[PDB]
Amino acid sequence: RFHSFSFYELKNVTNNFDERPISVGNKMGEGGFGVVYKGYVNNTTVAVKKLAAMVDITTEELKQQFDQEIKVMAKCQHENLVELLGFSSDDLCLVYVYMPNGSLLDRLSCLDGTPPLSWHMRCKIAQGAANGINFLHENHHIHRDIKSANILLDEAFTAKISDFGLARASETVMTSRIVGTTAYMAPEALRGEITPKSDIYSFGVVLLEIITGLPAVDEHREPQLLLDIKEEIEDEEKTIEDYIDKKMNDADSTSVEAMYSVASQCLHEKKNKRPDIKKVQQLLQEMTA
Numbered sequence: 552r553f554h555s556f557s558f559y560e561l562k563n564v565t566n567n568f569d570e571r572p573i574s575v576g577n578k579m580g581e582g583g584f585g586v587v588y589k590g591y592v593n594n595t596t597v598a599v600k601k602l603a604a605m606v607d608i609t610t611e612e613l614k615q616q617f618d619q620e621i622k623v624m625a626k627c628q629h630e631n632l633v634e635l636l637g638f639s640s641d642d643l644c645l646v647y648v649y650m651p652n653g654s655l656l657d658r659l660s661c662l663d664g665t666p667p668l669s670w671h672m673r674c675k676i677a678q679g680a681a682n683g684i685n686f687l688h689e690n691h692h693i694h695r696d697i698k699s700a701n702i703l704l705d706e707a708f709t710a711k712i713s714d715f716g717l718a719r720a721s722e723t724v725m726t727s728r729i730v731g732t733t734a735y736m737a738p739e740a741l742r743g744e745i746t747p748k749s750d751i752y753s754f755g756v757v758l759l760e761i762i763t764g765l766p767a768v769d770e771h772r773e774p775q776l777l778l779d780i781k782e783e784i785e786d787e788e789k790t791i792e793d794y795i796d797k798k799m800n801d802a803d804s805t806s807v808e809a810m811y812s813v814a815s816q817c818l819h820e821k822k823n824k825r826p827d828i829k830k831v832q833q834l835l836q837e838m839t840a
């Protein structure tokens with residue numbers, strides 16, 4: 552149901568894969584498994600991800616993740632998942648519907664001078680991201696790479712989960728290859744366990760990013776890891792209000808504490824003490840009801 556592109560088409564519509572940033576070219580972002588380029592096809596802006604080995608990955612591994620991206624999106628179409636338009640397999644490329652407002656990570660940092668997200672917008676983003684994770688877990692998929700860089704924002708700032716190349720079927724199993732972003736990863740995931748409970752923990756880190764506006768890791772910050780503020784709040788050194796993003800004017804204490812409560816539950820170090828995604832979904836819905 553996708554569209555088969557040949558590599559020469561995508562090379563042409565990305566200005567020969569111009570590596571200069573758009574603020575300068577065609578490069579919009581980068582990850583461990585490839586670079587995302589802006590493309591223009593028949594007067595339509597698209598996002599083209601050309602896969603590349605940037606994290607010491609083999610050819611078979613990259614191809615396997617390429618096939619997993621297509622498999623997941625072939626069967627999973629949802630309001631809060633990115634929409635694939637096609638691919639190229641003759642270099643591997645994935646062509647997506649363009650997300651004009653980029654990643655949640657970039658909007659939380661106000662990259663390129665974009666205005667700060669309101670608390671109202673952040674609540675809808677948190678709810679939409681949870682709905683996307685729920686849809687994946689409902690379809691027996693573990694995402695394994697949940698982070699704010701992988702939550703994209705469309706023309707209505709609707710949250711769209713992306714990057715399913717590491718996804719695995721779910722019905723507690725183990726792997727020798729530990730993958731993911733450390734600052735978002737549950738302890739058991741860092742140990743090699745594969746479980747949907749690790750997605751919940753990662754989503755908790757995203758919720759802390761949404762509340763505070765701070766990146767999950769910042770080497771020039773104390774604490775360096777954002778998840779460490781939970782310990783500070785529990786040990787009563789500070790409060791969640793001490794860390795609320797000051798770049799909002801519409802955040803109220805009750806709903807902010809409501810989303811922190813969800814985040815705190817998601818961030819239980821013991822995996823069986825975490826809520827499932829469905830409970831996270833209902834807690835976030837009660838936050839705004």
Ligand SMILES: CCOc1cc2nc(C[C@H]3CCOC3)cn2cc1NC(=O)c1cccc(C(F)F)n1
Pocket residue numbers: 579580581587597598599600633634647648649650651652653654663665703713714
């Ligand atoms: C990796 C960063 O990706 C983007 C960055 C970015 N920056 C802008 C412009 C800024 C300037 C002002 O605010 C927005 C759009 N945009 C779209 C981006 N991605 C997509 O459209 C997109 C869509 C589906 C999948 C994927 C991915 F999985 F491959 N990516």
